[PDB]
Design a binder for this molecule. Structure first.
Ligand code: FE
Length: 244
C-alpha cells in the first residue's frame, strides 16, 4: 500500500510504498497527485534505482515536461511551471538542505485587513531575454481552488505603489510566507526525490555546504496563467508565454 506521512502542521509529507518510474498505475499516480496538492511538497526516499530517463518518464505521468533567495519558479513568465520533480544525484558531506514554504496557508492565515490588501494587489515580476509580467498577489489554485500568495524574489514592485511602499509590503508578506511554522527544511540523502507544487509554494536553496560538489536533477511541468479572485488573468508586459 501507498502511505503518506505528514512531516509538519502546514507543509511536507513523506510518501512510502512507491517505487518511482514509468510503470506506476493510474491509482498510484492519483494518490501521488492528491498528496502533492494537499501537502505542497512531498518526498520519496530510497529511490536508488532511478536515473534521468525514468525520472522524465515518471514526470510525464503527472504533466507535460517543460537559487539562494526565496522564490516561486519562473514567475517573470505568465504561464510559469506547475510543479517540479527533483532527484538527488550527488550530495556534499554536510549542509545542502532545501527550504519550501506553503503559500496557501500563508494566505489563509492572513488577518482580514491584509486579505483585503492582497486580493486587489498586483506585482510586476521580471527576470532582470526581457520577461515582464504583472501577476496578481492572490492566485486561485486551478486544482484545489485554494487562494495562494504569489510573490517571491522576482517581484520588482507592486503596481501603483512607490518603491519604499512596495518594499515594506513585500517584506511583510515574505516574512509570513517564510515563517518557520509555514516551512519545511529538507535534509537530502542519497536516493531522495522531492516533488513540489509551484502554484502553492516558494522555495530556497541554502549555501551551507562550503562549495562542496552538489548535483540534483530537475524535471519541470508546464503550468497555466494565474487567475485572481475576480477571474482576471496575469498580464504580459514583455516576453511571451512558455511553450515547449
Ligand atoms: Fe527555483
Amino acid at each position: 500500500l501507498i502511505t503518506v506521512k505528514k512531516l509538519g502542521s502546514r507543509i511536507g509529507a513523506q510518501v512510502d510504498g512507491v517505487s518511482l518510474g514509468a510503470d506506476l498505475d493510474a491509482a498510484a499516480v492519483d494518490q501521488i497527485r492528491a498528496a502533492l496538492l494537499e501537502h505542497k511538497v512531498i518526498f520519496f526516499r530510497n529511490q536508488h534505482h532511478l536515473d534521468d530517463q525514468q525520472q522524465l518518464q515518471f514526470a510525464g505521468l503527472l504533466g507535460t515536461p517543460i537559487a539562494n533567495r526565496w522564490h516561486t519558479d519562473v514567475t517573470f513568465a505568465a504561464n510559469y511551471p506547475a510543479a517540479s520533480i527533483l532527484r538527488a544525484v550527488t550530495l556534499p558531506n554536510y549542509g545542502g538542505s532545501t527550504l519550501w514554504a506553503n503559500t496557501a496557508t500563508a494566505y489563509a492565515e492572513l488577518p482580514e485587513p491584509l486579505k483585503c490588501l492582497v486580493e486587489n494587489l498586483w506585482a510586476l515580476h521580471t527576470n532582470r531575454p526581457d520577461f515582464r509580467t504583472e501577476h496578481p498577489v492572490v492566485r486561485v489554485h486551478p486544482e484545489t481552488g485554494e487562494r495562494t500568495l504569489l510573490a517571491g524574489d522576482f517581484v520588482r514592485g507592486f503596481v501603483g505603489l512607490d518603491s519604499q511602499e512596495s518594499s515594506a509590503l513585500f517584506e511583510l508578506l515574505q516574512r509570513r510566507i517564510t515563517s518557520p511554522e509555514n516551512t519545511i527544511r529538507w535534509n537530502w540523502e542519497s536516493g531522495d526525490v522531492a516533488i513540489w507544487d509551484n502554484r502553492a509554494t516558494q522555495h530556497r536553496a541554502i549555501d551551507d555546504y562550503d562549495d562542496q560538489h552538489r548535483l540534483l536533477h530537475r524535471v519541470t511541468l508546464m503550468g497555466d496563467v494565474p487567475v485572481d479572485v475576480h477571474g482576471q488573468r496575469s498580464r504580459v508586459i514583455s516576453g511571451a508565454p512558455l511553450a515547449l
